[PDB]
Nucleic acid binder design. Structure first.
Length: 97
RNA sequence: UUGCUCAAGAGAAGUCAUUUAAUAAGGCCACUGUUAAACGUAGGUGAGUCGUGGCUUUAUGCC
């Protein structure tokens, strides 16, 4: 909280910490063409909150990351991050569909 | 250390249930492959099984 109401980085315990890891956003390798999916839910009772449309994209995603390994408080923490980068569980999205 | 430092639009959802492209139709009616002749005379070959049996003089040939 104090990091936003002061100019320096200390206020003494540190006020903030720039993350040693920074990753750019992932972009699709292929230009997006308008593709949607129908979503009508089962049942004869056709009220609202049914017949929805979901946009999807059938391409590959690429992203760029960079870490200052020296900036890490514990130098050994870079290895678990690499393991996570290769074994990335799921990037937030409609994993159900 | 950058109007910065931190920052998931996220969790869930069947486009479903039903429908014969069906009923009818001749590619049909006509056509001669007609008419005539001297063979004068000189062109060749690719493929197994093994020790007496009925006649006949061993003979040597027949089945």
């Amino acid at each position: 909280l104090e990091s936003a109401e002061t100019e320096e980085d200390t206020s003494s315990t540190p006020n903030q910490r720039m993350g040693a890891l920074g990753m750019n956003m992932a972009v699709s390798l292929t230009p997006y063409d308008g593709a949607v999916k129908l979503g009508a839910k089962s049942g004869r009772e056709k009220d609202s909150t049914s017949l929805h449309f979901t946009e999807y994209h059938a391409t590959r995603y690429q992203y760029y990351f960079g870490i200052d390994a020296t900036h890490l408080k514990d130098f050994s923490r870079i290895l678990p991050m690499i393991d996570g980068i290769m074994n990335l569980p799921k990037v937030g999205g409609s994993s159900n569909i």
